[model samples]
Every structure is written in structure tokens, then in C-alpha cells.
Target chain A: MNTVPFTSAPIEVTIGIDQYSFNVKENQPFHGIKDIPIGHVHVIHFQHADNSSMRYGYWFDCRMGNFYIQYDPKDGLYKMMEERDGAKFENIVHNFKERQMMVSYPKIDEDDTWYNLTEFVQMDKIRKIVRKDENQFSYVDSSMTTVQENELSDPAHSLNYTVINFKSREAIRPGHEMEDFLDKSYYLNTVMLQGIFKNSSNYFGELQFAFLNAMFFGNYGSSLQWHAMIELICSSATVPKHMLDKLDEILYYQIKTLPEQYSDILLNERVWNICLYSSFQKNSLHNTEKIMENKYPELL
Target chain B: GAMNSSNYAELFNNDIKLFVDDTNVYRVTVHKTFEGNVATKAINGCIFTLNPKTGHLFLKIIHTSVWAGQKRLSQLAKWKTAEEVSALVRSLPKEEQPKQIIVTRKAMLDPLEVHMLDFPNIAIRPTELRLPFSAAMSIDKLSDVVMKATEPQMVLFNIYDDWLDRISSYTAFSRLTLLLRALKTNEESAKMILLSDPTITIKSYHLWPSFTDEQWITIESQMRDLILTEYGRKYNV
Candidate 1:
């Protein structure tokens, strides 16, 4: 039997009707366990001081409130419920492969608000009820096929996915604040970082950084500054194919939703120059022209 | 005694001379003279004359001789200097001369040159002209259009002529650069000048010579702001 001293303090929580405690410590250098699972959640193990028994897994509490535990396979991170005083959780089940969780909450008179575990510390709600006890829990069907299907149709299912999936409706909702659903600054900041990283070897990265910087930091009268940067980026041979595609998608969406005054700027001669230059491959320039061709065929 | 045909031919030579009179009217004269009787008889047949006003006189000769009995315009008559009848009558002796020498005024101006000189000065409304922009248009045509549309006072005709002459040897890009620079000096005039020629629209950008894509890319980046500004001014955008 082997035992190691605890490196940090232990955390205690209530699961069902019983109180449970566990200490989190780094895995020892030569713990003799060769097959440790690699994941975002630290592979934690619980054992008695005497080393007589051992258990390794996650810990969750089932209470009636607004929270759930979901493991995201995209980043391999487990999105667990936060320990907030007012929040509640009725039942939870983890689907590690799909990175999803079937969560249930006690019915509330007001509409149930599902919070994303990544940005916030909350969980989604499950439609069907399941049997759960203090020691163990099981679904009506172990495969959770129906539960996964139900989540697909659930209006709140997008909360579990990426911010990209959040429709424009969420972005422009009347009462909902921008920060509440879409963090423009946060995304722009990430884009800046991406630009910094890409610029090390490619000039295209510098163009992206210049564009975003001009867009966010510069004055807001016209989109010309950023549009010029976009043209520079599109003209660059060093730019990656996927990056150009991403730009095209962005332009298409912008033209679709942006106001007529601003949207017309994107379809100007600057864009035509890009299209004329990009003969080797289809790029944002070509795609944008096609979009304009469909929307304003006469102008084309 | 009757003059010999060969002698008359030898004496006439048909060397037409042009001189501006005190009234600025041009006078047509022949180098040799003959008696009125012989001159009148010689003038009855077709006569060819060469004018010595400008250099390359041989290249500028006018053959008034009958081609299958059709009389062509006399070179002197064509310039409105002297008519065939007047020349024949003037060839008569002073004894048979009219009381007054009824000479017509000299044609001081070439009609085509006059039209070209006056083209830029003509006032034209903006609504009357439609300038279509064409990149494929030759620099010569572009210069021609600009010259025709330009306000005469805004730019001298000589400057446009000089630009036209220089563009023949310039590369495509240089031609465009010169065109823009010419316009750049006078923005207001350039706006009207460009607006007047319907061939100067944005679509003409596509007709530009096929320089390297990178070159065009660089040019467009620099050109867009300037062009858009000019376009906006012209279209009131």
C-alpha cells in the first residue's frame, strides 16, 4: 500500500442526503499506476488513510435548482455546476462521449433560464425524469438515445454548444443585453490573439490584426478602414484557404443582416478588385460578388 | 505667231506660289508669265500646281488635272486663296484687266484644326454628357476625350497635346499615372472633365492593361480612396 501527503486542501459538498469530502492533489511522480486517463478534469482518486480501498471519478450533487454538469469533448473539459448559494440542481447525468449532460430542475413559475457552463456556472434542464438516489443513478434507457434526441430539439440546447451556434436572434434580442449573450469584446480579443499568433510566419496575420484593431479601436464613421484591411488580406497570397473562406462567410452574413448603408460598402469596387485578383481560387471576393449578384442582380 | 504646245508647257511649269497680302488674304501666283492669248489658251487644258507654303511641299501638291474629265478642286481654290477663273483672268495683260482686282479673302484657318481648337471651349451641360469608363481604352482616345471635354481655361491645349505625345512611349501603368496626375492638379476641373466623358466610369478600371495582379493590388489600395472621393464628388455621393 502507498500513500502520499495532500498537496492542497480538501473540498466538501453535499450529494443527495449525505455529506462527502475529497482532497485534490497532483498525481505523484511514480504512483505505479501506468494507465492514467488523460482529460481536462484532473484524474482524481479517493482512498482511506489506511489505503485499504480506492475510488477514482467525479463528484456531483443532485439538488433542485438551475445547474448541470457537462463534459465538453471539443476541449475535453468538464463543465460542472458552480457553487452558488441560490442555484439549484434536481438531477444530472454525464455523457462523456457526446460531451453532453441531461439535467433536470424543479419547475419554476418564471421561465427557466439555461446558463452555459463555460461562460457561467450553470447547467441545462432535462425534459424527462429519471431515477436517482444518493448512492447511484440510472436512466430509463441506459443509452440515453431519447434523451439526446430531446436535447437536440430543446430550445436551450444551443447553450451547451459554441457561441457560434447562437443565432443572431440571441444577439439582437430586445431585452437581453449584448454582454448577457454575446461578448463582442471577448470574441474580438480572441481574434486579436489569433492574429498575433498567425503573424509570426505569415503577413496575412498582420493584416488580420490591423483590420480588427482598426475596427474595434478606431473611429466608427465608415467601414472603409477595416474594408481596406480586408482587401489587403484577401490580396495576400500568404493567407490560408480556410482563413479566406472564414472571411467570405463573415462577409456574406454581414451583407445579409447589416443595414443597407453599411452593407453596400462591402460590395464596392474594393471587393471587385479582390474578385478580379483571385483567379486561382474562389475567395471572399468571388463569394461576395455572387451574393451581390443574387441580391442585386441589376447592380451586378 | 501661235505659241507651240511644248513651248507653252515649258513656260507654264505650274509652280503655284502663296503669299499673305496686307489684308491677311492669301494670294496665289505662278512663277512664270505668258501673254494673255497664250495663257488663256493654256489654262483651257488641265493644270497641276504645287503650293510652297509649308515644308514637304512635294507631299502637299494638289493635282487639279482632269481625271476622266472630272475637274478636281484647285489647290489654290481649295485654300480659298484664288479661283481658276481669277487666275486665268489675272494671267491676261494689264490692258484687258477689270477696273478693280476682285480678290477674295484668304482662308486663314483650316476647318478641322479650327474645330479641334474650339472643341474644348464649347460649353456643355453635365446632364448632356455620359462618360463611360473603359480601362481598355487607349491613352490616345482617353486624351482625346479629355481634351474634348476639358474646360479650355482650366488647362492649355498645348499641355494636353504634350501629354498625348508623351503617352505614346509610356507604359500602360505610367499612362494611367500621368492621366491621374493631369487630373490631380485641378480637382474641380478634373471632376467636370471626367464627368463629361462617359468613358471614365468605374467600370473602366477593369479595362486597364493586365499588369501583374500584385501590382494592380497595390495600385487599387492606393487608388480606391482617391477614386471613391472623386466618384463621390461627381455623383454627389
Candidate 2:
């Protein structure tokens, strides 16, 4: 006696109205096929009352193969086969709807790859589990028979986007949306200051201090801190026109007067530092020149 | 009265004397004595003649021994002789000589070198010797000595740390008073010391600390009257 290569004994299904018996051969289940665990070699055997029988066999290996099922309207059954297999299995239709079984396999090719081969068999049409990408499958009804190329979705905008656009002068001014956004989140004013400092060449003009005040709510600091800040602004190799104009006015007036006592010497030092560091106005320089020349002639 | 060439040579060889004419011209006379009891003989028994400009004197000697005499004359005509001649020229009437004769060599030497000559022949003057004074000398004497030694020169008052601290804490009015006192004492030197090289000298870390702009404005407003009086017109402040 020869041993048979069967994973398990055949299960029988009886059709009492036709006096026929159906046999199904099962193998070890396939866990490798994605999303389709119930995949293996399937054999169907049919026997009539007169002992005449037929057998159909196939294998599911969708990782290396492509498979599909088509409905036969005349017989009202579905025919499954490897896509490469000829019409031999095309004529073979079966009433597998008697049992609700899912048969899924990948449709692989040079460019396309997807794997949810869900089928909801019904009387009129078959529902499809179709996806162009994995984990993104959808139930595409058979009635909707259309094929189109997929496109990338539209991009979402953000507040940083508005900031860059406004900074680069692509937009003349920020819209109320961005203004409201920044007004609510005060910490985002740092971004505004960064934009101002980095893009000083843009014409903020007389409105420069207006934008500066937006960064800090009009409270710069003490007199010392204010002078220090002015010094830092002047320290830059380039400055906005209006900013320099304002600084020139302030510093020229401050340094033109004489300090009365030694206690005021620090202020004079700070003013002198600012004058030396900045692109001082000619009038201010002349005043300083006169002071040094007349009061401290030896310094010249 | 009438003489041959040989007789004239004999007379000229006897002795030659220099005489100044009324027209400032010099004439030579050969004689043992030109006037009563006035010997007109040449001191070396040799005479040579030279022509110099008016108001100038010239002499010549005709012997190898004259070189020693010339060297002695040059040695005597140094700064001392120049000083004596300058003093004598000044004492004379205005019409007698040039207003002054600045001896070129003496003037060319350093003034210190000329002053150093005054100390010669006084190896141990009383001023040069140290007095037997104790370390605990009187403050008045020390101050007098310091002022006398450093006359006509600015005295630099060193501001020690404690003095700076006290001065720094002074009120605006007090500072103004001190500044006015300083200015009153020696106005020009005080201003020079206060304003000249302020960054390095007066505004050094220990001398004067720093202040803010507000503090400076306060100070200037406080001393407005003094500033206007002292520096307003000059600095246009």
C-alpha cells in the first residue's frame, strides 16, 4: 500500500436533493499571505449517485502569484484561478457561497502592489476589497466600475507659513487670521522679532518701532537696559533707516549736554560708547568734537 | 726828514706800534716811544699787522712762540669771558656797542651745562649737605619744602581708595561745593586735572565710578548754575 500525501482526511458535504456528495481537501493554513490567513491548497471532489466524480485542485501563493475570481452569471457561481492560468479554470464555476469563506491574495506586478482580496459574494454582484496601498483597503462595490490615476492630496497651511510669507513680502500684510493667531499666543512674538531682525532690509520705515513694540508690550526696561539695548542695535554692521534716525536723535541730545558730577560719568561713558559704535550723525559728531576740543583740548 | 730806502727799512724794523685814528682807521708807527712816558714798543720785539672791520680788533704775532700765546688766549675766551664781556657791553652807553653780543658757542651749549658751572668751587654747600633732621619732622616744614622744591609745577593729589569712597558718596550740592573750592583755589590747573584725559586719569576704576543717563541728567540739572557759569559758553552746553 502507498501512503497518500494529504494534510487531513477529506470532509464530505451531501446534496440530498441531487443525490450527490461533495468532498473538500484541506492543507495546512497559510499565515504568510498578508491579510489572508486561510490560504492553502484546495481540492474539490464531486460524486453523483451513479459514482461518476470530478476533482479540481489549485494553490494560493499570492506573494509570488496573482489571483482573481470572476462570476458566471448563467450558473450563478464564482470561478477562482491564478491570473496566469488559462480559461481551463474560467469555465469551472462553484457555488462556494454555501459557506462564507474569505479568499485573499496579493495582486503583484512591475508597478502595482495591494493585498486585501476580500469578496462578499451575493446573488447579483461581488463586493471587492481593493487598495492601491497596504492597510488602506476599501470596499469598492462592483456597480462602480471605473479606473483612474490617484493623486496626492492638497497640503494644509500653518501659522509659520503666514509668518514667512509676510516676512518675504509675498503678502503686503498679515490677514486678520494670522493677527488673531499671534495675538492669542504671545510667545509667538519671538518669531515676529526674529523676522524683523533677520529681514531688516525690508522697508519697515517709520513703522519699525511699531513692530518692535509688538515684540515687547511697549515696556523696554530701565534706563540702563534701554541704553544697553540701543548699543546692541548700533553694534550691528547695518541698521534699518528709521531705527538709526531715532537713535541719532536720542544719542545726539543725550551727549550734547555736560554731566555735572562724577556720578554722571557712567552715563557719559555709555553715551560715548554708543556714539563711537554707531553711524553717528554729523551734527552729533560735531558737537562731541567741539566739546573735546574746547573743554579737553589736550585729548585732541 | 728825507730818508733813503735803507734808512726807511731800518726805522720800520726798530719797533711797530698800532694806533687808532680819529676816523676809526688803524695806523702803524715805528718808534721806541710815540708819546712821553708811553712805550710804543712791541711786547715780543716782533710786529705783524692785520686789517679788520670797524668796531673789531685784530692782532698778529710773528714767532713760533706765538702759538702758545694763541692757545692761552682761546682758553681765556670761554663762557666766563663771554659772560664778563656781555655784562660789560650792557653797562656801556647805548651808542658805544651793539645792544648785546650773544656769544654763539656759550649759547649753543645746554642751559643745564651752564647752570652746572655755578656749582664749581663749592664742593660742600650747606644746601647740598643733608641736615641732621629727625624722621618726625614738622608738617609745616615738610609742606614748605615740598612747595619750594616743586614750585611752578602742578601738584598731583593722589586719590586714595578711602578718599574716593568718601568723595563718591557726597551729595550733589556737596560735590558742587568741593568743585567750586577746587576751582577757586587754582582754577586753570584744577580744570586741566579734571578734564584732561578723563577716561584714563579722573575716570579710572578707583577714582570715578559709572552712572546711568538718568543719574547724569539729575546731576547736570542739580549743578546747572555752576555749569553755566564755568563751561556753558565754551562748550555751548
Candidate 3:
């Protein structure tokens, strides 16, 4: 419902195999849904200001091609509104603004006085730092995974895995910036990682992304809609070239602690897939562009 | 410095403005003005052919800027593109040519450009150009006088319904109705063509009810009695 143009009533339509309660917006003709049944489909009656009316649940023969029965004033009897396909019936109903929802994986600890840390990090103000922060890095193969704690510890390192890490401490929180940075990096890297999915030069890099995407996205998302969203998220996070072998573990731990819903949606490949075919673009890029504008205000 | 009430009506009374002669039809090249925003930038323009001998107005509400231009400068360029087209049309032989041409250009045009039209054959009328909507009023009067002067020829108002705002801002639709009604009653029975260019592009209905079937039904049906509409190739709105 984000930025849905023109206020409209949701009409529940049941025709053949189509059963979703679809929206009837202004400037659009009354349409039931895709995959409509060829028989009697039930629809809510719609009345026009011209005193013309379309009754609900008429016997619709799709093969007969789009005519509906209405009152034929000339005959003083009912007649079908013929060839309704591509028929433009006008209705005057009613900017319409969420560009993107930040992807967060961890649950924020909350109290009566506490706001959800996850929510704060997802907001534009938080994600912006990650967009502008200079220390961002993306690494293929978690061989660079961990904070140099004990050289032998390599929990997140693997062949079909990639992790993005930051070299500067400013990239994460100091006083109370942990959750905020955790969510921000997750959102950013999710956007950045998709760029490597098919574009990475390394053969295993592509395989690593594809394998994980199928696992996360196939488990929680649809085929067409979710993958685009993931790509958009990965694309939003900007940075690259040689992860700090020792510094990535912080990001690694963050992903490890991500909550179920956050992980499901963030890693969902269909969310990324949907963006490819839909209007939602990589808003993270927009955010970076904004930061760049402020960084160079005198610039065009 | 633009034409005013004193000399405004002169443009119409000039003999050259009468559509060259009886043999060939003349064309009116049209343009839409800016509404100061991106949403209302596109103006529907038309090329109407009027046969001086038979008094018939053939209207063609051709291609539109509906999805093309975005801002005032771009819209101006789009209009100028159409102007070049009218120039090509005028280059045809007088016996087979469109007698004269009229176009509504935006005020932002270079003054040197206006100076270039110091002739009776090709005239440039500016939109929102000068005092008290004088240019618009003069243009309206010009349409009235010229239509009445020419024995059998008609004046075509091909500015599509989309740009009606440009006219409606200064002149009343009722005023146009009256002039059209007068043309209908001319001794030679002059005619007027109000071409309706419909768009099939997916657009939001929340904008306005003006061009929708509901509103157009009343508007077109009423105008049909006063003037004939030549849709070129008509289709259901």
C-alpha cells in the first residue's frame, strides 16, 4: 500500500480461480483479477453517476468476449455491456511514501522506557551513516571472517560464504551505537551483496550468493517479488575490495544474532526479485546520493 | 511592446490572414503553455485543415506531449519542433498550401525570435506575454473576426482539452461557445472544429474529472450541437 495512487475501496472479488480482495482505484476500470474463472464470477455491484449500473455475480463467459448485461434503454430491457475487455469505465474516487523498509535481523531488547532498537536503526537517519561511512568492505569467502580474537577461531569462514566488514571503529557504535550499526550494516550489506550475486568475477562468489539466496529467499519469499528487494538492499550498501580479515567478525556476529523475521525478509531473494520488475528501486542509492549532495552542496 | 487593443484586431483584418485563397486549405499549428509544474506540462496540439471553398474544418489532434516533455524549456522545444513543421507546411505552393499559420508560444521565447516574424503570412502569438491578458484576448478576437470575414472558411480550435486550462484561465468556455455559436450562424455559415485527442496511456484518475467519459459526455455532447468534431480516427473514450 506504499504510495498507492488515488484512494480507493478494496473490493472482494471471487471469479473462477481469482479470489483476492483487490483494490478498485480511480482512473481504472472495474477489473476482477488475473486468472479469472470463465464462469459466474461474483463481484460487488458498481453504480455510475450516469445512472448506469453493473450488477454483481453475473454469468461471465470469457470466450464470448467481455460484454456484460445491463439495462438497454432502447429496448426497455436488460442487455450486456459488450466487449468489456480493455473497456475504460471511469470512476472518480478519491502523492500519495515509504520508499523502503530497513532490513534488520536482530531483535532489540526493549523495556517500558525503551524503544525498539531495531526500529530506530531501520529509520533513514541511522541507515545514512552506513551509506556514508568510508570503511565499508565486502569479502568473498569468509576466510576474512572474525575479529582476530584467537587466530584459530574461524566460525563464519567457509567456501560458499561472503562477509562484509568495516576497518574503522566509527563504522559501528561506541557508547550505544551497537544495535543501530548492527541494523544499518545489515541493511547496507544486504543491498551490496546482491551486486556480487551474478556479477562477481570469482565462480564460487556467484555460487556462494546463489546458494544462500535460495536457502533464505526460497524459505521465506515468493518467486518474483522478494529477490529484487534483496538485490536492492545489497545494492544500497556501498563498499568493496578486500575485507579486513580481522575486522569482519563484528558484522559476522551481527548477522549471527539476527532475529527470525528480520533474517527471513532481509535474506529473502524474492524481495530482491520483486524490485527488478517493480517500481521500488534501490532507495539506498538515493540515500547515498543525498549524503553526497550535502558533502558537495556547491556541486550540481 | 506587444500588440494591444488598439492594434490587436488589425492582425485578423489583414487580407493575408484570410487563408491565402480559394484553392487550398490552410493549417493552424498549435502549442500549449506551461502550468508552472511537471504534472501539467504536456499540451495537446493539433493541425486543422480548412477548405476555403467548402467551409469545412478538418481537425487532427495529433501526437501529444503527455509523456514526452517534463519542464517549461522542454515543452518550449517541443512546440518549436511543431513550429518547424508548420514552416514546412507553409513552404508548399500557395494554390496547394495552407494560407497562413498561428501558434501559441510561451513567453520565455527569445525576443529576437519574435522579431523574426515581421510578416503577414506567419504570425507568432505569445501566451502570458503582456498586459491584462491582451495577447490572449486579441487572439480570441482575431479568431472571431477572421472567421466572420472569410466567406465560407472556418476557424479551427485544435488546442486539445488538456490545454483548455490555458484558455479557460483567461477566456471563458462560455465565451468560446458564444463565438462558436456565432460562427454557426454566419451568412455563409462558417464552421468550427474542436478536435478531441484522447489518450490511452495509463493515468491516474485522481487528478481531475475533466477528460473522463463522465465529464466529456456532457461537454462533447453539448459541443456536438454547435460544432463538428473530426477525431481523424475516432475511438471510444
Candidate 4:
């Protein structure tokens, strides 16, 4: 049996040849998403801070309130990742700006008010890396259907075929299998988002950003495939019910226009991808059904 | 702080805050939030139509949208200038020209928003604009509606918002940094009014903290030249 040690000092580990050390508070229960059968652990998780994307040290049970210093690789800046899902990272908006955004995780007493367990503990910035292949979990069905590993890592591999042959919601029963599929897909998305964050040159990152760049500038081309794949990945992650709904609307617009006019009909609108993802807690079925209601009330 | 009612109406909802100032200038401000969350935003703009109070007016929104792509706004694509803004502002029917054309901030303004200040002496509102709709189509649908403004009166857009992440969140760092420098260097009439909490606070999370001073110099040169001219001031002749 392997022994687990809890320590107040920083713990260091090396992957391949890269060494990373992180401060481990002794009292905080140590948590990690790990290779359980072999006991390998990686502590990297992605988040949003002040409208910018961030990757930080996410201790397990994010709702319990994880606190870590986040390193934004895209711009090479640092921030204190303070999430208060149900904890006491509490303060007014004005105070939130006044402080460096840190405090000990909170515990409430009999008074029914929040209590600061400790003064804000300033910790040194920590760096950790998760290898592309470090993901240890996979989902499978009795039908032997599985997701392609390259769905996000490599865009040129043609997941488009999978989208074409997509199974209906009725075929996949709502259970652990679908649950597993959705959960892991969301994990892939966070990783995929970081895939761009870490290496902007990677195929998926570039493709995704190119799509984003065009949309940001309110310009579009006959990039049907970009919208197709964006829909595919978005459905794979959060809601599958209304996959391609927006694309269908675009195509509808495309058909009604004159031959010379199809080119300029392209309107940049995919920024909603971030909006859709951020709106719901991952794996909530109720959220998927509302894509139409949320997206196009005119249709309803 | 919570956004003022009018700015909130413009920012989160599709309804714009459009009103003619006492000076007879027509101003249009649009606000957009992200994930329908007030805490974050997507994009916002305040356009000061140079040919005020007339349907036959000059309007242009260049240096618009959210952020700069990896490449320079000048080199990557069209880079809008103060000259274009002035030209577009001036190219209206004779009757549309205003005695005092004004472009100012009505609500929360970002660095890119400052690019509109290429006009001389823009009077920014002390308050900021606040607003989001979820679903990908609402964004597409809203933008489609926004782009249908092809009237006889026209404005040129040389610079535009080309960054995706910034568009999603309604903020920018380098673009604003450059505008800050322009407010100091462009013209005496040019000034900036800040929101109690401006949106650039989000930029700290940017991969890069800000633009280098050298990059700011280039940005100012490309986007601020027209405002320095006499034409950028009140209409004459």
C-alpha cells in the first residue's frame, strides 16, 4: 500500500524532466484527480477570472471552495483564484477591488453569519503541468461506441463524420453511461480551452481562434465546417438536444439569399459558445432544452 | 456598483439609450453583457453622429468591437483612423451638419471606446452603460440586426474589434492602454471620463498584463491621427 503524506511545506514532483513544486497546507484535506490504479496525480484545472480564461491548481471538490494562485499562460499574468460557491470568500464589490482577492476558506458559526477562519494567507505562486495524455478516465458503452481522442487535440482528423452519424437522445438512455460521456466531454472542453491557452499554435486552438477572430470582427466566410465543428463540440460538451440549431438558421439564411449575396450573409455570432457554456452547471439536462428558447425566441 | 438604469437598459438588453443632447447632438449607446451576468460583459459602444438631429446624417463605427487580434489592427486588416471618423462625420448632406458635433462617453467606456474620441472635446457622461442574452443565436441574430444599417449616409470603419475572448467578455487591455496615451497626446479638447469601476479591471487576467509602450506608440499613430486635425474639431465653413 502506498502511504499518503500531508504536509505544510511545498511538495515537488517531476513529470518527464520538468519539476513542479506546490505549497500544501497541512490541515486542508489533500485532494487530486489522479491515476487511481497506479496512483498518479495532477492538480491542474481551468477557470474564468475577470472575463479572461485561467488555469489554476484546483483542489478536488470545487464547490467546497478551492483557493489557488492561477497562472494565465496566454498573457503570462498571475491572479488569486478565489471561488465562493458555498464558502466565505465573502466581501462587498468595493472591498473585492480593495484587496488582492485572498482569504482563508470560511466556516460559519451558530450565529448564522460567516466567519473568517484566518487572515488572508498569502502564498507563493505555483506551477503545475498536465501532460496531454495525463487524462486517466474514459467512458465506454456496451455498443462499443467511444469518443475519438483527437476530437479536440486534432481538428483535421474529421470528427465531422461522427456529427453526421450522431445518435439521437432517445437512443442514449439517461444514466451513468451518458452521464459519463457528458462529464468527460466537459472535461475535454476545459482541457481543449486550455489546449489553446497553453499552445495557441495547436490545430484545435488555431481553428477555434480563427473562427473566433472572424466573428469578433463581424466578418464571415463560407466556413460552414467551422460552424459545424463548433456545434459538434458544443453539443458534445453541454447540450446535444439543439445541436446545429444556429447553423441551421444560418443555412436557412444562406438558401434564401441570391447567388451573389451568399458571401456577405456571414454574420459573426459564435461568441455565444462561451455564453452557453458558462450559463449552466455541466450535465444539467434542463439547460440543453432551452438552447432554442435562449437562442431564438422568434422561432418559438 | 450597479449600472445606472438607462445604461443598464442599453448594456444588458438590446434596447439602446438614444437621446439628443441639449446641444442638438444625437448619441447612441449600446451595452452588452456576457452569460447574462451583470458581473461580466461582452461589448459596448457610444456613437456620436456628426450630422446631428437630421435623418440625413453621417455615422461610422470603426475602432469598434472588443480587442486586437494577435496581429496589429493596422496590419492585420483595415485600421480605422480619426481622419476616417472625421470624414465620415463630415460627409453628410449640407442640412445634416451640426453647429456643434459631439462624441462623448455616456456610460462605462473601455480603451477601444476611447478610439471614438478622435473627435475633439468629446464629453463623456460621468456614468457608465451596463447589459446579456445567452444562446449562440441571440448573439448572431442581434449582430445581424446591428449590421443592417446601410443608409444613404455612411461612415468608414478602418479599425475594428478582432479579438474573440475580448468580444466574449466586453473588455480589452492593450487597446485601452493605447487610448490612454492618446487622451494625453492627441489634442487638448480630448479628455477621458472613467466609470467608478471601469471594465479594464478585467484585463489583469489577460495572458499579457498590457501592451508595451512601443506597441502603444504604434496604436496611437494608427488610430489617433485624424482627431489631431482641425476637422476633428467643430464644423467650420
lDDT of 4 by residue, A68-165 (tens): 34334575433224444523332232234344222222222342110110011011111111122221211111111112323323332122211211
Task: After superposing candidate 2 on the true structure, give the runs of residues whose Cα lies further than 4 Å from its correct spot.
Answer: A1-221, A257-259, A262-271, A274-300, B1-237
lDDT of 4 at B154: 38
**Evaluation by lDDT, superior candidate among 2 and 4:** 4
What TM-score does chain B of candidate 2 reach?
0.16
Those runs of model 4 whose alpha carbons end farther than 4 Å from true positions after fitting are: A6-300, B1-237
Residue-level lDDT tens digits of model 3 in A1-300:
000111222332211111212333333333222223333212212333232332222222244343333344464323234433332322211101122211111222453111111111111221121122221211121122222222324444322222332312332333323232323443344333344433222322232233332222231212111233234234333334332211122223223333344444444344323322332233323332344234322322
DockQ of 2: 0.00
1 or 4, which is superior by lDDT?
1
Error of 2 at A255 (Å): 3.0
The iRMS of the candidates, in order, is: 32.5, 41.3, 28.9, 22.0
lDDT tens per residue, model 1, A141-234: 1112222234333333111111221223322223322231222332222333244333312322223322222222221212333354354444
What overall lDDT goes with each candidate model? 0.29, 0.27, 0.30, 0.29
The 10-residue segment of model 4 chain A with minimum total lDDT is: A114-123
DockQ of each: 0.01, 0.00, 0.00, 0.01
Q: Which lDDT tens digits does candidate 1 get at residues B58-121? A: 1111222322243322323333222332343345475532222211122322211121221232
Model 2 TM-score on a 0 to 1 scale: 0.15
Best by lDDT: 3
Is 2 or 3 the stronger prediction by lDDT?
Answer: 3
TM-scores of chain B, in order: 0.17, 0.16, 0.30, 0.23
